Amino acid sequence: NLPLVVALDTEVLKAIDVAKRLKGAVAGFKVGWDLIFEGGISIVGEIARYGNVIVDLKIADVPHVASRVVEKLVNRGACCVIVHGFLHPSLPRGQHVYVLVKMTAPTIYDEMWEKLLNSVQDVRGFVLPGNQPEVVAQARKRIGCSYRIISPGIGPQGGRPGAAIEAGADFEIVGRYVLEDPARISQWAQYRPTCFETP
Amino acid sequence: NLPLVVALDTEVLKAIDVAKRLKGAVAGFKVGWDLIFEGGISIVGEIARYGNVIVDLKIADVPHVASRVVEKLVNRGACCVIVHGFLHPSLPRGQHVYVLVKMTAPTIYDEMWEKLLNSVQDVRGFVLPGNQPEVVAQARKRIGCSYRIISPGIGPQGGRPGAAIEAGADFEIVGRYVLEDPARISQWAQYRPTCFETP
Ligand SMILES: [Cl-]
Ligand code: NI
Ligand code: NI
């Protein structure tokens, strides 16, 4: 399959249609508030029928709340969840957790992302912005193949297809550019994850 | 005007009943993860029938996404929405936005919350931890009554009822403690918001 996680930022039925269409062709699907707002958490389980589901609600709550939230999501079928690294040291951990340490837009992460990255362990991997392949490459240098790296910020007006993967990422997260025409997934055909076969 | 926002961290039907019971007795209701997961976004409109709704999904996404999520929640009946200040300078703005700048648990905010507080303008208000009254008081020396302050972390395991209001908060946010026995709201009877009559 292609090293692409498709963000399903669209309506429930259309999201299911895309997941059905792309099952086995891509590495997974990203489910966010657009979908969860429509009918609730059940949508996670529907998409999870068709592939690995990363739930991305940018989780950033205190531990006893974050714990409950992650548990509900994984129980509904999520493979993993994206959480904010800024919570450190109150950071959800474990193999179901991806830790965001720099965003695609300017934030307080910018002054500290590499120190934060170096301090975090016992997680599935990290989210690094694919619109900054230099950041992805430096991250991979720091951590080697010890953890996954997944990267959004790929598509029009960010990193071109494969830019983050070439810089060291495992998977690129892409939304509208693929949703508007899923045939475009062929642009990732030449690429393979840097370190891990699955997200 | 009890200076209390009741967190409906519970199931949909129970949340409805509690809100009906407390209609006009409290300042508002906080709708979060648990309710949205169960009932989707429609729950916001249902609770709004009974009082002001603050939606707390700890929004922490890039500002185009965040601003659209805020607007969608407001359109469904929310008066305002809590977002993470860590995303500065890529933060949504305006009268529907409460900005969290320090949590009840240890996080990276703790080394910079006051600088962040002073950097953020043109929002509705700030969320500051009521289990740390000293932080609420220091925030007022910096911002005065220019913006609202609301505070969670109030309860048997946190700050005493009124502790945050006395330190300078406008409203305290309380969940389980009040849900267990709604008669407990009487503990807030002798308190009044420091700066703003409404959240
Ligand atoms: Cl991002
Ligand atoms: Ni995963
Ligand atoms: Ni409000």
Coordinates of C-alpha atoms and ligand atoms in Angstrom, one line a residue:
Chain A
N1 CA 0.0 0.0 0.0
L2 CA 0.9 3.6 -0.4
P3 CA 2.6 5.5 2.5
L4 CA -0.4 7.8 2.8
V5 CA -2.9 8.4 5.6
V6 CA -6.0 10.0 4.1
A7 CA -7.7 12.6 6.3
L8 CA -11.5 12.2 6.1
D9 CA -12.6 15.7 6.7
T10 CA -16.0 15.4 5.1
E11 CA -19.5 14.1 5.8
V12 CA -20.1 10.6 7.3
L13 CA -21.4 8.8 4.3
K14 CA -18.8 10.4 2.0
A15 CA -16.1 9.4 4.4
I16 CA -17.3 5.8 4.4
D17 CA -17.4 5.9 0.6
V18 CA -13.8 7.0 0.4
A19 CA -12.6 4.5 3.0
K20 CA -14.4 1.7 1.1
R21 CA -12.9 2.9 -2.2
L22 CA -9.4 3.2 -0.8
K23 CA -9.3 0.2 1.5
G24 CA -6.0 -1.7 1.0
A25 CA -4.6 1.1 -1.3
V26 CA -3.5 3.5 1.5
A27 CA -1.9 3.1 4.9
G28 CA -4.8 4.4 6.9
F29 CA -7.4 7.1 7.6
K30 CA -7.5 10.2 9.9
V31 CA -10.8 10.9 11.6
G32 CA -11.4 14.3 13.2
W33 CA -14.1 16.6 14.7
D34 CA -15.8 17.0 11.3
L35 CA -16.9 13.4 11.4
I36 CA -17.3 13.0 15.2
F37 CA -19.6 16.1 15.3
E38 CA -22.0 14.6 12.8
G39 CA -23.2 11.5 14.7
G40 CA -20.7 10.9 17.5
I41 CA -17.8 8.5 18.2
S42 CA -19.5 5.6 16.4
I43 CA -18.0 6.8 13.1
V44 CA -14.6 5.7 14.4
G45 CA -15.8 2.1 14.3
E46 CA -17.3 2.4 10.8
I47 CA -14.1 3.7 9.3
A48 CA -12.0 1.2 11.2
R49 CA -13.7 -1.6 9.3
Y50 CA -11.7 -0.5 6.2
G51 CA -8.3 0.3 7.6
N52 CA -6.1 1.7 10.4
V53 CA -7.8 4.8 11.9
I54 CA -5.8 7.6 13.5
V55 CA -8.2 9.8 15.5
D56 CA -7.0 13.4 15.4
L57 CA -8.8 15.6 18.0
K58 CA -5.4 17.2 18.9
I59 CA -5.9 15.8 22.4
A60 CA -4.9 18.2 25.1
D61 CA -6.5 17.6 28.4
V62 CA -5.5 16.6 31.9
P63 CA -4.5 13.0 32.5
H64 CA -7.6 11.5 34.0
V65 CA -9.7 13.1 31.2
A66 CA -7.2 12.4 28.4
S67 CA -7.1 8.8 29.7
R68 CA -10.8 8.3 29.4
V69 CA -10.9 10.0 26.0
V70 CA -8.1 7.9 24.5
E71 CA -9.7 4.7 26.0
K72 CA -13.1 5.5 24.4
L73 CA -11.5 6.1 21.0
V74 CA -9.3 3.0 21.0
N75 CA -12.3 0.9 22.2
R76 CA -14.3 2.1 19.2
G77 CA -11.6 0.8 16.9
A78 CA -8.9 3.5 16.7
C79 CA -5.4 2.2 16.1
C80 CA -3.9 5.4 17.6
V81 CA -4.6 8.9 18.6
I82 CA -2.8 12.2 18.2
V83 CA -2.1 14.2 21.4
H84 CA -0.3 17.5 22.1
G85 CA 3.3 17.3 23.3
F86 CA 2.9 20.6 25.1
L87 CA 1.1 18.7 27.9
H88 CA 4.5 17.3 29.0
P89 CA 5.1 16.1 31.6
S90 CA 1.4 15.3 31.8
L91 CA 1.6 13.4 28.5
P92 CA -0.5 10.4 27.5
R93 CA 1.8 7.6 26.6
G94 CA 1.8 4.1 25.2
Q95 CA 1.8 2.4 21.8
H96 CA -1.5 4.0 20.8
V97 CA -0.2 7.5 21.1
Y98 CA 1.3 9.9 18.5
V99 CA 2.8 13.0 20.1
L100 CA 2.6 16.3 18.2
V101 CA 5.8 18.4 18.8
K102 CA 5.6 21.0 16.1
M103 CA 2.6 22.2 14.0
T104 CA 2.2 23.3 10.4
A105 CA 1.6 26.8 11.6
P106 CA 3.6 29.0 14.0
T107 CA 3.1 28.1 17.6
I108 CA 5.0 28.0 20.9
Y109 CA 6.4 24.6 19.8
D110 CA 8.7 26.4 17.4
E111 CA 11.2 27.5 20.1
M112 CA 11.4 24.1 21.7
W113 CA 10.4 21.2 19.4
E114 CA 13.7 19.4 19.3
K115 CA 14.2 19.5 23.1
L116 CA 10.6 18.3 23.5
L117 CA 11.1 15.5 21.0
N118 CA 14.3 14.3 22.7
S119 CA 12.5 14.2 26.1
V120 CA 9.6 12.0 25.1
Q121 CA 9.7 8.2 25.1
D122 CA 7.3 5.3 25.4
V123 CA 5.0 6.5 22.6
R124 CA 4.1 5.2 19.2
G125 CA 5.7 8.1 17.4
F126 CA 5.7 11.8 16.6
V127 CA 3.8 14.2 14.4
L128 CA 6.1 16.6 12.5
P129 CA 5.1 19.2 9.9
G130 CA 5.7 17.9 6.4
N131 CA 5.7 21.4 5.1
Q132 CA 9.1 21.7 6.7
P133 CA 11.1 18.7 5.4
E134 CA 14.2 20.1 7.2
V135 CA 12.4 19.6 10.5
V136 CA 11.4 16.1 9.6
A137 CA 15.0 15.2 8.6
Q138 CA 16.4 16.6 11.9
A139 CA 13.8 14.7 13.9
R140 CA 14.6 11.4 12.2
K141 CA 18.3 12.1 12.8
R142 CA 17.6 12.5 16.5
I143 CA 15.5 9.4 16.9
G144 CA 16.4 7.1 14.1
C145 CA 13.9 4.3 13.5
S146 CA 13.0 4.0 17.2
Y147 CA 9.6 5.7 16.6
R148 CA 7.2 6.4 13.8
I149 CA 7.0 9.9 12.2
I150 CA 3.9 11.0 10.5
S151 CA 3.5 14.3 8.7
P152 CA 0.7 16.5 7.6
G153 CA 1.4 19.7 5.7
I154 CA 1.6 17.7 2.4
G155 CA -0.2 18.9 -0.7
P156 CA -0.8 22.3 -2.4
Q157 CA 1.2 25.0 -0.7
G158 CA 3.1 22.6 1.5
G159 CA 5.5 19.8 0.9
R160 CA 4.9 18.1 -2.5
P161 CA 3.9 14.4 -2.4
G162 CA 6.7 12.4 -0.9
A163 CA 8.7 15.4 0.4
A164 CA 8.2 14.4 4.1
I165 CA 8.8 10.7 3.4
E166 CA 12.1 11.5 1.5
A167 CA 13.1 13.6 4.5
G168 CA 12.5 10.7 6.9
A169 CA 8.8 10.4 7.6
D170 CA 6.9 7.1 7.6
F171 CA 3.6 8.4 6.4
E172 CA 2.2 11.6 5.0
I173 CA -1.3 12.8 6.1
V174 CA -3.3 14.3 3.2
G175 CA -6.8 15.6 3.1
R176 CA -8.7 17.6 0.4
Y177 CA -6.1 17.1 -2.3
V178 CA -6.9 13.4 -2.2
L179 CA -10.6 13.7 -1.3
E180 CA -11.3 15.9 -4.3
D181 CA -9.9 13.2 -6.6
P182 CA -8.7 9.9 -5.0
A183 CA -7.1 8.9 -8.2
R184 CA -4.3 11.3 -7.2
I185 CA -3.0 8.7 -4.7
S186 CA -0.9 7.4 -7.6
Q187 CA 1.5 10.3 -6.9
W188 CA 2.7 8.4 -3.9
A189 CA 3.3 5.1 -5.8
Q190 CA 7.1 5.4 -5.8
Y191 CA 7.5 6.0 -2.1
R192 CA 7.8 3.7 0.9
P193 CA 7.9 4.5 4.6
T194 CA 11.3 5.3 6.0
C195 CA 11.2 3.1 9.1
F196 CA 7.9 1.4 9.7
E197 CA 5.5 -0.6 7.4
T198 CA 2.3 0.6 9.2
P199 CA 1.3 3.8 11.0
Chain B
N1 CA -26.3 34.9 39.5
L2 CA -24.4 32.0 41.1
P3 CA -20.9 32.4 39.7
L4 CA -20.8 28.7 38.7
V5 CA -20.6 26.9 35.4
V6 CA -21.6 23.3 35.8
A7 CA -19.6 20.8 33.8
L8 CA -21.9 18.2 32.3
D9 CA -19.3 15.4 32.3
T10 CA -21.9 12.7 32.2
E11 CA -24.4 10.9 29.9
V12 CA -26.7 12.7 27.5
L13 CA -30.0 12.0 29.2
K14 CA -28.6 12.8 32.7
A15 CA -27.1 16.0 31.3
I16 CA -30.4 17.1 30.0
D17 CA -32.1 16.4 33.3
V18 CA -29.5 18.2 35.3
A19 CA -29.6 21.2 33.0
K20 CA -33.4 21.4 33.2
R21 CA -33.2 21.2 37.0
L22 CA -30.5 24.0 37.2
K23 CA -32.0 26.3 34.6
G24 CA -31.6 29.9 35.7
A25 CA -29.9 28.8 39.0
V26 CA -26.3 28.8 37.5
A27 CA -24.3 30.8 35.1
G28 CA -24.0 28.2 32.5
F29 CA -23.0 24.6 31.4
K30 CA -19.8 23.2 30.1
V31 CA -20.3 20.6 27.4
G32 CA -17.3 18.5 26.5
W33 CA -15.8 15.3 25.2
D34 CA -18.2 12.9 26.9
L35 CA -21.4 14.5 25.6
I36 CA -20.2 15.2 22.1
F37 CA -18.9 11.6 21.7
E38 CA -22.3 10.2 22.7
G39 CA -24.7 12.6 20.9
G40 CA -22.6 14.4 18.3
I41 CA -22.8 18.2 18.1
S42 CA -26.6 18.2 18.4
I43 CA -26.2 18.0 22.2
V44 CA -24.9 21.6 22.2
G45 CA -28.2 22.9 21.0
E46 CA -30.2 20.7 23.4
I47 CA -28.3 22.0 26.5
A48 CA -28.4 25.6 25.2
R49 CA -32.2 25.4 25.7
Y50 CA -31.5 25.6 29.5
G51 CA -28.6 28.0 29.8
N52 CA -25.4 29.4 28.3
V53 CA -23.2 26.7 26.9
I54 CA -19.4 26.8 27.0
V55 CA -18.0 24.1 24.8
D56 CA -14.8 22.5 26.1
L57 CA -13.0 20.3 23.6
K58 CA -9.7 21.9 24.4
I59 CA -9.5 23.1 20.8
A60 CA -5.9 23.0 19.7
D61 CA -5.7 23.0 15.9
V62 CA -4.3 25.3 13.3
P63 CA -6.4 28.5 13.3
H64 CA -8.4 28.0 10.1
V65 CA -9.7 24.7 11.6
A66 CA -10.1 26.1 15.0
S67 CA -12.0 29.2 13.9
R68 CA -14.4 27.1 11.8
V69 CA -14.9 24.7 14.7
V70 CA -15.7 27.7 17.0
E71 CA -18.1 29.1 14.5
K72 CA -19.8 25.7 14.0
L73 CA -20.2 25.2 17.8
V74 CA -21.5 28.8 18.2
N75 CA -24.0 28.3 15.3
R76 CA -25.3 25.1 17.1
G77 CA -25.9 27.1 20.2
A78 CA -22.6 27.6 22.1
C79 CA -22.0 31.0 23.6
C80 CA -18.3 30.4 23.7
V81 CA -15.5 27.8 23.2
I82 CA -12.3 27.0 25.0
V83 CA -9.1 26.9 23.0
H84 CA -5.4 26.3 23.9
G85 CA -3.2 29.3 24.2
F86 CA -0.1 27.3 23.3
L87 CA -0.9 27.8 19.6
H88 CA 0.0 31.5 19.9
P89 CA 0.5 33.4 17.6
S90 CA -1.7 31.2 15.5
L91 CA -4.7 31.6 17.8
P92 CA -8.3 32.3 16.8
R93 CA -9.6 35.7 18.0
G94 CA -12.9 37.2 19.1
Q95 CA -15.7 37.3 21.5
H96 CA -16.5 33.5 21.4
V97 CA -13.0 32.4 22.4
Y98 CA -11.8 31.6 25.9
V99 CA -8.0 31.0 25.9
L100 CA -6.5 28.4 28.3
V101 CA -3.1 29.5 29.4
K102 CA -2.3 27.2 32.4
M103 CA -3.8 23.8 33.4
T104 CA -4.6 22.2 36.7
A105 CA -1.9 19.6 35.9
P106 CA 1.8 20.3 35.2
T107 CA 2.5 21.2 31.5
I108 CA 4.8 23.4 29.5
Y109 CA 2.4 26.3 30.2
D110 CA 3.8 26.5 33.7
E111 CA 7.1 28.1 32.6
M112 CA 5.5 30.8 30.5
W113 CA 1.8 31.3 31.3
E114 CA 2.0 34.9 32.5
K115 CA 3.9 36.0 29.4
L116 CA 1.4 34.2 27.2
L117 CA -1.5 35.8 29.1
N118 CA -0.1 39.2 28.5
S119 CA 0.5 38.5 24.8
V120 CA -3.1 37.5 24.0
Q121 CA -5.6 40.2 23.3
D122 CA -9.0 40.5 21.5
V123 CA -10.6 37.3 23.0
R124 CA -13.4 36.8 25.5
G125 CA -11.3 35.7 28.4
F126 CA -8.9 33.2 29.9
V127 CA -9.1 29.8 31.6
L128 CA -6.8 29.6 34.7
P129 CA -6.5 26.8 37.3
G130 CA -8.7 27.3 40.4
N131 CA -6.5 24.9 42.4
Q132 CA -3.9 27.6 42.1
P133 CA -5.6 30.8 43.4
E134 CA -2.3 32.6 43.4
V135 CA -2.2 32.3 39.6
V136 CA -5.7 33.8 39.3
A137 CA -4.7 36.7 41.5
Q138 CA -1.5 37.4 39.5
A139 CA -3.5 37.3 36.3
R140 CA -5.7 40.2 37.6
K141 CA -2.7 42.3 38.5
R142 CA -1.7 41.9 34.8
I143 CA -5.0 42.1 32.9
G144 CA -7.5 43.7 35.4
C145 CA -11.1 43.4 34.3
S146 CA -10.1 43.7 30.6
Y147 CA -11.1 40.0 30.0
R148 CA -13.1 37.3 31.7
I149 CA -11.4 34.6 33.8
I150 CA -13.0 31.2 34.4
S151 CA -11.5 28.5 36.6
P152 CA -11.8 24.7 36.8
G153 CA -10.0 22.7 39.5
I154 CA -12.5 23.5 42.2
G155 CA -13.7 20.7 44.4
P156 CA -12.8 18.4 47.3
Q157 CA -9.5 17.5 45.5
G158 CA -8.8 21.0 44.3
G159 CA -9.5 24.5 45.4
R160 CA -12.3 25.2 47.9
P161 CA -15.6 26.6 46.4
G162 CA -15.1 30.4 45.9
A163 CA -11.3 30.1 46.2
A164 CA -10.9 31.2 42.6
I165 CA -13.6 33.8 42.6
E166 CA -12.1 35.4 45.7
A167 CA -8.7 35.4 44.0
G168 CA -10.2 37.2 41.1
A169 CA -12.1 34.8 38.8
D170 CA -15.5 35.5 37.3
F171 CA -16.8 31.9 37.3
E172 CA -15.8 28.6 38.7
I173 CA -16.3 25.4 36.7
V174 CA -17.4 22.3 38.6
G175 CA -18.4 18.9 37.4
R176 CA -18.7 15.7 39.4
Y177 CA -19.0 17.3 42.8
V178 CA -22.1 19.2 41.8
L179 CA -23.5 16.4 39.6
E180 CA -23.4 14.0 42.6
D181 CA -25.7 16.4 44.5
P182 CA -26.9 19.5 42.8
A183 CA -28.0 21.0 46.1
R184 CA -24.3 21.7 46.6
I185 CA -24.6 24.8 44.3
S186 CA -25.7 26.6 47.5
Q187 CA -22.0 26.7 48.5
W188 CA -21.5 29.4 45.9
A189 CA -24.3 31.6 47.2
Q190 CA -22.1 34.1 49.0
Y191 CA -19.9 34.7 45.9
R192 CA -20.2 37.0 43.0
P193 CA -18.1 37.3 39.8
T194 CA -15.1 39.6 40.2
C195 CA -15.4 41.5 36.9
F196 CA -18.2 40.3 34.6
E197 CA -21.8 39.5 35.4
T198 CA -22.0 36.8 32.7
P199 CA -19.4 34.2 31.3
Ligands
CL1 CL -0.2 20.5 12.6
NI2 NI -1.9 4.2 14.2
NI3 NI -19.6 32.1 27.2

